[PDB]
Structure formats: C-alpha cells, structure tokens
C-alpha cells in the first residue's frame, strides 16, 4: 500500500537495526517475522510464495 507506513513492520520485539533486510510480512497476518525467528523449517529469504507456518496450516 503506502510506503509511509512501511516502518511498522518489525519482528516481534526483535528487529531493530538487525536482520530487517531478511524480514518477511505474511499476507494476512503480515506484521512481521524474521526468516530465523519464526518461519517454516526453511530459514532463508524465499524467492517464491511466502506464507507463515500458521497461514499455510489452514488452506
């Protein structure tokens, strides 16, 4: 949406001045999750379809 509200995406507690580059936002529950903080057994920056363990859990 608007880039003005892009800084509101920071990992739960974690995410300040850190790995923010590898930071993901899961469409639907999309506030924040670092690829190694809480993601599938796959911690990498994905290059395909992204969704968190919980959202993939109910499709």
């Amino acid at each position: 949406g608007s880039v003005n509200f892009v800084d509101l995406y920071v990992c739960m507690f974690c995410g300040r001045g850190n790995n923010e580059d590898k930071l993901l936002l899961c469409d639907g529950c999309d506030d924040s999750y670092h690829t190694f903080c809480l993601i599938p057994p796959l911690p990498d920056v994905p290059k395909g379809d992204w969704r968190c363990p919980k959202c993939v859990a109910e499709e």
């Binding site: 880039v3 892009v6 995406y9 923010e20 580059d21 590898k22 930071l23 993901l24 936002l25 920056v45 994905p46 290059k47 395909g48 992204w50």
Partner: peptide, 10 residues
C-alpha cells in the same frame, strides 16, 4: 517473499 528491501522504492 516480500522484504523491507523490496517493499520500499528508496
């Protein structure tokens, strides 16, 4: 995956 790096257009 959408990242902080991508989302922003600098």
């Amino acid at each position: 995956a959408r990242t902080k790096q991508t989302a922003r257009k600098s």
